[PDB]
């Protein structure tokens with residue numbers, strides 16, 4: 001297990017997300033679904049010139065899976081997947097600029113709901129999750145698990161759990177007071193409100 005420090009700017013963003021009073025928490029789902037769609041768009045585009053890129057799975061879709069016993073909401077997609085470099089360095093390099101822009105907008109009267117316009121919507125997960133685990137597999141790289149509970153650090157390890165073929169799974173370990181996001185009616189409402197036109201099937205699993 002390797003432990004890394006967030007860039008200071010990202011840590012600051014995460015603290016703002018965690019600490020600011022902001023009731024409209026539901027936006028986290030739209031932002032994660034949007035990231036999944038972006039990743040799906042990318043593998044779809046690449047497959048047009050190299051069909052072999054789909055050998056790791058033809059189906060392009062998003063699943064939403066609540067688990068009350070584990071207190072998790074999991075978002076699974078079969079998009080392009082992230083590489084180790086993406087996880088440790090490259091996405092963070094991009095996020096630094098977006099974060100600066102977002103922070104400036106907030107000071108100028110924007111609200112947290114606009115976070116996605118700055119490319120850093122993933123961090124909105126911390127509105128509702130105490131811990132976030134991201135399991136990801138890109139073609140020709142290994143399966144990785146990224147994890148953070150904030151506090152300025154994240155971990156990356158090679159993942160030895162169930163192989164996913166290709167894509168990303170975001171596991172949200174929900175805060176104790178945020179279990180509404182495990183309810184079918186609530187998730188369904190949120191998807192309809194904010195994600196109705198996503199161009200890939202979104203299946204909302206129900207609980208056993």
Ligand SMILES: COc1ccc(-c2c(-c3cc(Cl)c(O)cc3O)noc2NC(C)=O)cc1
Nearest residue numbers: 032035036038039079080081082119122168
């Ligand atoms: C907005 O920034 C990003 C960055 C990475 C990604 C991404 C993802 C990806 C990332 C997150 Cl956080 C997610 O919730 C879902 C995803 O499928 N998988 O591969 C990716 N690679 C690219 C190039 O799309 C999706 C969005």
